[PDB]
């Protein structure tokens, strides 16, 4: 049910070069509960100062 | 007269008595209610949902 964009027409796909070592950079960012990182709001209701 | 705060153990005992009556009365009844209700837990949805 594809719509809007025409598909199945392309001469070729671009060549891709993969280097894992360059991508291997360490920048740790741990979840913090105090900062409420990645915490979904309760879908049921909003709350006051409680 | 100057010291009637946390330093005075007897004053803390008066606060404990006031806290005990309130927790045993308003807090206990409200928390116990809603706990035993599977659905609405207050009106009970007698005609609303049952």
């Amino acid at each position: 049910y594809v719509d809007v964009g025409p598909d199945s027409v392309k001469s070729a796909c671009i060549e891709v070069d993969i280097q894992q070592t360059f991508f291997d950079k360490t920048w740790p960012r741990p979840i913090d509960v105090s900062k409420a990182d990645g915490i979904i709001y309760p879908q049921g209701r909003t709350y006051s100062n409680i | 007269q100057t010291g009637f705060t946390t330093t005075n153990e007897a004053f803390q005992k008066v606060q404990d008595a006031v806290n005990n009556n309130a927790q045993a009365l308003s807090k206990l009844a409200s928390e116990l209610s809603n706990t035993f209700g599977a659905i609405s837990a207050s009106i009970g949805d007698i005609i609303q949902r049952l």
Binding site: - | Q48, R49, L50
Partner: protein, 49 residues
């Protein structure tokens, strides 16, 4: 309900009358083909597989 005659109506955890007039967060509807022979087999929970 008027549009389709209901061969079997069973409502669980909700009143049959209540579903028509209750106000709630979202409505979920499902449709599938069911045999009359397996109408008895179909249940919210059943010993039968």
């Amino acid at each position: 309900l008027s549009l389709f005659s209901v061969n079997d109506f069973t409502c669980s955890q909700i009143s049959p009358a209540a579903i028509a007039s209750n106000c709630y967060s979202s409505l979920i509807l499902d449709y599938f083909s069911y045999p009359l022979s397996m109408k008895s087999d179909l249940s919210v929970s059943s010993a039968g597989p």
